[PDB]
Amino acid sequence: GPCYNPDAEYLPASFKGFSFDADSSDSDHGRNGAEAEFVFGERTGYADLGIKIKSYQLRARFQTNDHIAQTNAFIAVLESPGPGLLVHPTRGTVFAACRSARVTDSKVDAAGVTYVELDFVEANSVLSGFG
């Protein structure tokens, strides 16, 4: 649209309480099943087996005079034990667990900015025992 205010339409991202500014937002929905291919046959089958586990991928940026301290704090938060609450900019609140966080940080090529490529997975609670 012509009068689309982005930051009034995208939610400010944050994981486990710590807030940050995100640069991308993805998702990996799906529906998994089997696929039957009976021999010598002009026919095919399909069987729905359940829900494909959701996964989110983000890219956070840090462009500030103290981006090193912010990135260190964000690393310390991401390595906290157990899954926590994530605010996906376009999917709202979910419960995810961090799975990888690459921290690109160059000096003689681009000093000042630090990028973090984050990879979260829908982590739903369980009930210990045999549920």
Next chain:
Amino acid sequence: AEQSEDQANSQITVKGHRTQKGVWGNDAIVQPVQTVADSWVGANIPLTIQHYGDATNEGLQRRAKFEADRRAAESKSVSVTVFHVWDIGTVHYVEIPPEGIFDVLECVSLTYTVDAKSTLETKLELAPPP
């Protein structure tokens, strides 16, 4: 489908001894014998499976026919994997023309398998149409 020939037998001879009360000597040492035959195998592949209780004529022939059904049912083993998931003794018509099956077979086994990703399939092992 696999109908081999190393697990078949033309003549099964069952011998043994009589364990009744009073019966002794020849009538309990000599007579008891029986020779059942499977007129499907071919050449003379003999055998002798001996008996281990009260060897009557019917007892002999019956142990004989039991094994003559075991060896028979092992000499045409048809494992089929079907799709979605009642056949532990069921008979079905099966048609696999390329291996020449047009016959009514008994499912000896039944295995349901599952795994949330790519499965839900049933493996049947069947029984020969002599």
